[PDB]
């Protein structure tokens, strides 16, 4: 009985920005879903494919953890449906999702006193994303009918925009840390599942 390292993804000191969400594999474990549900620190624990109270007897071929940091308001855009902006340009969920989303407030940690800069979010893309596609590339993006010769006027704006994350805003704007678990039962021997 060798437990699996979830503690290395939830208590990590640094989380990736939304447009470059971290994507970690987990395999060859005995995952303990008891802690992840009973905990009193989360503020949004949701599961779509399988209700939380029966995760102790479902063996998956593989499991992935996505991790990132989003605005407090926009946490209502991480869902199969419920499209919008962030789910439209940065991280889109597949429609037949079988997984869970865990979002909790981190007002104290991820917000500095004078104004942070390490967190950026995408804007101004050519077309809406497709499920799970990661686009970390930065290229100067065009407004309308104008050649893009490397510089910004009323023609080509730089996509990424910077979060402020001031420590004195209302509850609707302080950062929220999000971890999305995705389960997979591909044709292979079952490895990871609870005791």
């Amino acid at each position, epitope marked *: 009985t060798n437990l699996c*390292p979830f503690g*290395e*993804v939830f208590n*990590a*000191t*640094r*989380f*990736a*920005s939304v447009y*470059a*969400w*971290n*994507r*970690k594999r987990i395999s060859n474990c005995v995952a303990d879903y008891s802690v992840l549900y009973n905990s009193a620190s989360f503020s949004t624990f949701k599961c779509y494919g399988v209700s939380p109270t029966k995760l102790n007897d479902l063996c998956f071929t593989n499991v992935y953890a996505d*991790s990132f940091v989003i605005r407090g308001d926009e946490v209502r855009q991480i869902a199969p449906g419920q499209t919008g902006k962030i789910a439209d340009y940065n991280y889109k969920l597949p429609d037949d999702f079988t997984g869970c989303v865990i979002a909790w407030n981190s007002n104290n940690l991820d917000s500095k006193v004078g104004g942070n*800069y*390490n967190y*950026l979010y995408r804007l101004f893309r050519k077309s809406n994303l497709k499920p799970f596609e990661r686009d*970390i590339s*930065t290229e*100067i993006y065009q407004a309308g009918s104008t050649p893009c010769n*490397g*510089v910004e006027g009323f023609n080509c704006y*730089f996509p*990424l925009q910077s979060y402020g994350f001031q420590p004195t805003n209302g509850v609707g704007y302080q950062p929220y840390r999000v971890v999305v678990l995705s389960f997979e039962l591909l044709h292979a021997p079952a490895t990871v599942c609870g005791p």
Partner: antibody
Amino acid sequence: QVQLLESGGGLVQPGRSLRLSCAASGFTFDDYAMHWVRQAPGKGLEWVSGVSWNSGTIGYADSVKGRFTISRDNAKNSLYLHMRSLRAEDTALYYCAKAVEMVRGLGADPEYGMDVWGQGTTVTVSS
Amino acid sequence: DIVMTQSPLSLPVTPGEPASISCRSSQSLLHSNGYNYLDWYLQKPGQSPQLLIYLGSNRASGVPDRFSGSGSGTDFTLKISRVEAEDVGVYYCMQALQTPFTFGPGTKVDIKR
């Protein structure tokens, strides 16, 4: 053997962009926090930026904050640095270094120990 | 936003004697764990720099046992017990506590005559 190869150097006029790339080969790229460190011509070193083991940046230097943008990719074992709105004072070599302590091997997570260094490029700016 | 200093600024050493270099900070780097986060780095003339000491005094891997690190609070020192012909170049001390990190101005070690 561990290798750290960087590319992207070349003359660039002021007020443009560049995209330096550092590729690592010979270790588990996900258990080491990378760093990008400049080196002025005939002067001392200077820390520029870094990235932890979960693609979470750790802040930039005080005088450069506002333009540089770091990014990572564990699938392709790569670390990219986009650089916008240059000035004449950003000509220097650039090394990409690796941390020493593997994560969760012993309080907090490790960030120090820039042990292995690739041979840096020679970015320059002039008109 | 932490500023260091080093001393002496430049010293000439002769092969076969120890030498001592001091790095000083502004805020004591004693973390909650009780570890000082200073690191000592070396650069040879014409090559990429290399690591000497990490975590205050824990000796780095692959370097000989001729180096020693000590100190705490806001003052740390590096001592080379038996200097030789292959110990010339520049030395730096780097913090690891409060981002952004910083490098000292650098000590220039050369051969005396």
